[PDB]
Design a protein around this ligand. Structure first.
Ligand SMILES: Nc1nc2c([nH]c(=O)n2[C@H]2C[C@H](O)[C@@H](COP(=O)(O)OP(=O)(O)OP(=O)(O)O)O2)c(=O)[nH]1
Ligand SMILES: [Ca+2]
Ligand SMILES: [Ca+2]
Ligand SMILES: [Cl-]
Ligand code: NA
Length: 328
DNA sequence: CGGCCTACG
DNA sequence: CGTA
DNA sequence: GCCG
């Protein structure tokens, strides 16, 4: 009854198994810190199965038949149902390794590999990193300076005002260019850790060279606290107004030609697990290669022309899911 | 057992 | 290596 | 860790 791929079932933003999904996601995250991407995926997939269920899981027998629930994930759920707490999950939560890798990897510019190396060197706190700043990249220095603000959620209420300053710069850079809100906010989220915008122009080719022009105008307006600088993705830190002040916010800007816009919209709208599952489904079940630029048939060596996300789901033989049901 | 998404900066 |  |  429950299909094995998350892109085959609707997954709403809020659901009926929040506590169980959150515990499995802790185990997924810990697997990621240890470099076990397979274990990370299984725990994330099991969590997403629960998000897709129509009612709360009451008893272990309701997990029989569900995909991605074997010995380990089933024992986690069983302990939460019987005791309200999973010993394994709480042990991870209070471990020094978990807490430190979580704190380090949440820094912009620090990935699992860097956080792991710092952990092995004996570092444990942000103040530890600030005392040896010559070891840091410029990106990591910015992530560390702005860490407090960047750890505060961006509110959907902030986004409209930010979209209009981006739209102003985009319109000067290229009249007729459009800005589309993507990411979690497009899936209905009321907060997020960053804002994601997709930029295009209805005349194919006109978008070439656009993003540098946009970033030069935003920087001239004094709005850019950090950015990396030809390119098509920019990961920047923006000055967002607040009452009598301002706060730093992460903003991602992406440019796509209009021919690729449906693929880019699909990819940047997520969720991350949804898109990994969709790409896995495309390749393993349909023999087609999917990315944020297009959908390739490697037999005929042809790209599928899409005018909408609906087109892409149809070409993969999948029932259409609106963004709000892509919260795997 | 192999596989686990696929890009760009 | 980082980022999405 | 789980699926096929
Ligand atoms: N294919 C692919 N897409 C990814 C990856 N990471 C990642 O964030 N994306 C896509 C799907 C995400 O929904 C989208 C935006 O990323 P994000 O980290 O801002 O996620 P979000 O908006 O859903 O989350 P948030 O800001 O509310 O916390 O980018 C990845 O590793 N692979
Ligand atoms: Ca986001
Ligand atoms: Ca983002
Ligand atoms: Cl693994
Ligand atoms: Na990071």
């Amino acid at each position: 009854w429950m299909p094995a791929y998350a892109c085959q079932r609707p997954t709403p933003l809020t659901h009926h198994n929040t506590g169980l999904s959150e515990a499995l996601e802790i185990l997924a995250e810990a697997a990621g810190f240890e470099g076990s991407e397979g274990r990370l995926l299984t725990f994330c997939r099991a969590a997403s199965v629960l998000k897709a269920l129509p009612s709360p899981v009451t008893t272990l027998s309701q997990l029989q038949g569900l995909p991605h629930f074997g010995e380990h994930s089933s024992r986690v759920v069983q302990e939460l149902l019987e005791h309200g707490v999973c010993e394994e999950v709480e042990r991870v939560r209070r471990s020094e390794r978990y807490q430190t890798m979580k704190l380090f990897t949440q820094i912009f510019g620090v990935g699992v590999k860097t956080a792991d190396r710092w952990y092995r060197e004996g570092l444990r706190t942000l103040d530890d990193l600030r005392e040896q700043p010559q070891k840091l990249t410029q990106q990591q220095k910015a992530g560390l300076q702005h860490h407090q603000d960047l750890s505060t959620p961006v509110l959907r209420s902030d986004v409209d005002a930010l979209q209009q300053v981006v739209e102003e710069a985009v319109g000067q850079a290229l009249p007729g260019a459009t800005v589309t809100l993507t990411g979690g906010f497009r899936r209905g989220k009321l907060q997020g850790h960053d804002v994601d915008f997709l930029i295009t122009h209805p005349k194919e080719g006109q978008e070439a060279g656009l993003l540098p022009r946009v970033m030069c105008r935003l920087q001239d307006q004094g709005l850019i606290l950090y950015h990396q600088h030809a390119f098509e993705r920019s990961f920047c830190i923006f000055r967002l107004p607040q009452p009598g002040s301002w706060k730093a916010v992460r903003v991602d800007l992406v440019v796509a030609p209009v021919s690729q816009f449906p693929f880019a919209l699909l990819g940047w709208t997520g969720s991350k697990l949804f898109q990994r599952e969709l790409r896995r489904f495309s390749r393993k079940e349909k023999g087609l290669w999917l990315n944020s630029h297009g959908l390739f048939d490697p037999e005929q060596k042809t790209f599928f022309q899409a005018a909408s996300e609906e087109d892409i789901f149809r070409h993969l033989g999948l029932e259409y899911l609106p963004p709000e049901q892509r919260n795997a």
